[PDB]
Design a protein around this ligand. Sequence first.
Ligand SMILES: O=[N+]([O-])c1ccc(O[C@@H]2O[C@@H](CO)[C@H](O)[C@H]2O)cc1
Ligand SMILES: O=[N+]([O-])c1ccc(O[C@@H]2O[C@@H](CO)[C@H](O)[C@H]2O)cc1
Lengths: 497, 497, 167
Amino acid sequence: KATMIIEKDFKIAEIDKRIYGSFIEHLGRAVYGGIYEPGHPQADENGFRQDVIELVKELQVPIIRYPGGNFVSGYNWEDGVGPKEQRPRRLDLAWKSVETNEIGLNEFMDWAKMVGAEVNMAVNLGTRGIDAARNLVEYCNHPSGSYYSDLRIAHGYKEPHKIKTWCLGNAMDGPWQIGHKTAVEYGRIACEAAKVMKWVDPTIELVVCGSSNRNMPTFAEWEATVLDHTYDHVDYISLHQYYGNRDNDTANYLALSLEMDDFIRSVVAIADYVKAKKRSKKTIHLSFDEWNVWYHSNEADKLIEPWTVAPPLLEDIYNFEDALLVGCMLITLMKHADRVKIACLAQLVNVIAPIMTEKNGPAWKQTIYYPFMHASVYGRGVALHPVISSPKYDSKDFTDVPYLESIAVYNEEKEEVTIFAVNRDMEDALLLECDVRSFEDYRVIEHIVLEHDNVKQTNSAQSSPVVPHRNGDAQLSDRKVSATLPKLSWNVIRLGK
Amino acid sequence: KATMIIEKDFKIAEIDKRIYGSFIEHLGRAVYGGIYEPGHPQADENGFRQDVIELVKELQVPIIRYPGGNFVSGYNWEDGVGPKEQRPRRLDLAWKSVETNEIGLNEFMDWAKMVGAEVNMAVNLGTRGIDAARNLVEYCNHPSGSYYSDLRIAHGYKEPHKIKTWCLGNAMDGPWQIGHKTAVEYGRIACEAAKVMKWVDPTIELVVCGSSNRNMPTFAEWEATVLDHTYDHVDYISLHQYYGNRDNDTANYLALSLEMDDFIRSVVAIADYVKAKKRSKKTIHLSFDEWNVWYHSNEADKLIEPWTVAPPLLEDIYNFEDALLVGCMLITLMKHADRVKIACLAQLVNVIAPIMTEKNGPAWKQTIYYPFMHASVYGRGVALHPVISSPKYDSKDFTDVPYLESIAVYNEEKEEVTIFAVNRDMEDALLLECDVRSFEDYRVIEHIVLEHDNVKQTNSAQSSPVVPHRNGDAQLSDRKVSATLPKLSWNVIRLGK
Amino acid sequence: VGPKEQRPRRLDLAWKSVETNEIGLNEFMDWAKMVGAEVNMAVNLGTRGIDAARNLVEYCNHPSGSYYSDLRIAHGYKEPHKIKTWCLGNAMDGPWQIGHKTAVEYGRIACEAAKVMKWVDPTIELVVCGSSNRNMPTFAEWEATVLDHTYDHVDYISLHQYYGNRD
Ligand SMILES: O=[N+]([O-])c1ccc(O[C@@H]2O[C@@H](CO)[C@H](O)[C@H]2O)cc1
Ligand SMILES: O=[N+]([O-])c1ccc(O[C@@H]2O[C@@H](CO)[C@H](O)[C@H]2O)cc1
């Protein structure tokens, strides 16, 4: 048995819809054979797969980070614009692939328009620096009357792209990165790039890069130093986290969102330290601009020979337990809506992705597609503070793990309240009771449930045994929602009227 | 009108009673003519003023920091123990006074026993270091069978003092401090002192010093560096704040607790940054070990000639608005009960103090005595998260200042809820409505009010025009407590059942 | 040193023991003479520093005619001990050590101690301390920094190793 109070007046914050963002890199088949496949029977006039477009639209992803990721740190943006005959073939050192540049930034912008997403554009601060950063902002955002703006027009794009949010490089702390920089070296170049970008277009916002991983030896130290160098000139700091179940311990695996919670709290603390050090009135928020499960494909990738075009890298096939953890991660983002304003599921198509494609063949929804879709579609509004009383368990790496992971979101315009809830219990149902006295005249619309008896079950092109159903038993009586949350389940309880 | 939800299940934390601590330094008349005055008519067998003892007991102060403060940084603890004829007269460079050492640590411990307080003992890390720190802990806490423990016994104190909580120096970031140290120098000596102290007695806990003032050029940087050097070896970081009304702006003055709130949040953030950097499982908490109003006596002190014994320094005479600000500071401490575990009103007797004495004469209660007493007496339990809707104003230095400053404290053992509330409005009463649905069968016990028509009115030995009354109108009807909070008032609304 | 009744009982924080000081350096020298060994004497560079280092070398090695040499004589040891080889502290890179010092802090105090010790008695030689363990995070870095600070003034660098068969 668990209880919850859902009080309209106990609020975290309005949820920024950009927490339901995603990310496409020039990596593997994310672009080539993912969003773009000129051969394909379902390709549009520009070569974009229409089936993939529909699948992304249904997720209602508001913002997509591009073009990297590790790729960007060795990339020259000019190589991907202008007539195709003049675009060079390059060695991408990030993913040991040949990049044809058949898709570059203007074609990506065309695709993003089709799916209804804005683009969070990254600049290269690995091999390049401040001059290229200002020039790219000018190219994309300045209307006309300068060399680079008139160049964009000549390339066929009269109106500026007007990109709002930009990433200052990719995480550079990683010794695997092209043009690795220490926190001081990065903080300095990011500061100077931020300035010139903002001078070209003061309407932009900037994301400064945090650590590649919470496990880096420089974790926390990095963020504090980088913010000390950049605070006045930037708007967000990023964080990145990938999880996996490499020891087949489901109870411990589902608890990993507790670590994510502490991780967010730690980076918020660093931002507020530096705010105080600077005596600034501006608050810096978080961009959780890579997050996902990533581990299934690690061994397969080791067999791929270098210098092919569009190798099948990072093609994790997700299972049901991966979906539960993704649900827990989503709820964790919502619970930090006050300070996490952007987040990006890494990545959107083929590469550690909720959408998978086959050459000349179908596109399909992985298990993780469903909780992401439900969060994005039903998770707009104000995140309410969870007062939860829940039974708890201990695992290898965590103590006092609540069986219930939940939050409610109130949308005043739609007059809806949605309760997202994971039951982590591997054996028993959890009887949830929610005090909803603060909302008058509400009823249960539906109770969606994602569950499967085998946590290792996957979806595929041919069959999808892991799919939601609408037979949850939530009922609302004398100002109390009572709902049975099945063992190992993701639940979306929708209230309205 | 203002509203407030008093929800039992929306909790901040259990209040550590040590947030109602105080502080006595060898400064002015705090010791000599304050707690200790041989031949005063109310002096006991050991020369301690009984009237002061009774006044301190009524405040229920659980812990008292001693002996400094700036004094400790030039003090040799051996100078204050053993037979009086062998105790040297010293020049105290902190307060430009001659210190006779007629009172030293063992006599202070005797006094502390009379008022029922434990002592938060500070070690000198200005002119002294790690050897003196281990020796003092041995002297105080080791039972017997070593030179320093047997020395304590020979000085007349068979049983060890068993001091739990120790300060590693006094703030020495300040260029006015004896033996100023940079953050690195201080962090290093504090680290090595902490270790040897703990090796003498592992039951102790340690407070590492924060900045002298939030306005120091090294604020925030200091705390981060000091914790980086000491984290594994210490338990708390300190913070210090004094306020004054030097431009006669009451509306701006009463808003200052908003700054105190930001200040605490900033130091918490620093502690959590360093925790993440170290990958520690230990949370460091805060000791707000100097706070008060301090400004009235600044000009008078400039006329005192150096090298007298017990000069009348820091003798602020508090007024009614000062008591309102102190009330707001107390509520702010309670609002941070989750992370502020020790706090010390600086100071307890004569020196910026709630209790004042006259030579061979009376002891009396300053205006600020009353809100401190009420907080300490009625503010034990769990601090509840305030959910308030209040009208607001702007002042010189602050925006959106709520007219209402309030919190509720729930004592389950006493079956009581106490609402502390200041109305900052200089013209209008505030009609407070409190939702108490979650406290069924609770009734109003009493409504205490501290108010005076003249914010500049003081108390004195001869008369106390500023004193609480019990004519508050709080009343319960239909699960709602409604109370009129007069303009410029401190209110204590006690509920029970 | 000196009469036993004036020797204090101390808390030894290293091994969490009470040290009575019933044996001190002069008695140890008497023992060493019986087994035919010279003594490699260590000075405290944890809680103490350069003054105590010069004074101890004077006490042990200076013949007579100064306070500390005449003190040794008064304690019953007319002839100086004439200790050749001295350790500048014990390894203090370790967070378990009393008065831990960074490599720079240690290098500096060891340098200044070495100088005054040698000025009391130029016949001595000095050992500067290496890491407590090869597995310390500061291994190798430590030795390089410490020698950079002390090279001209010292004769040896130390190293320490313990083994076990715990699997
Ligand atoms: O933890 N790791 O092993 C790890 C490895 C690679 C890594 O790179 C990030 O993930 C890649 C895929 O999204 C992006 O290009 C890059 O920014 C981030 C983390
Ligand atoms: O901001 N200031 O002006 C200021 C002035 C003095 C000051 O010292 C502190 O306040 C003294 C009195 O409680 C204690 O001895 C010392 O720790 C701390 C701050």
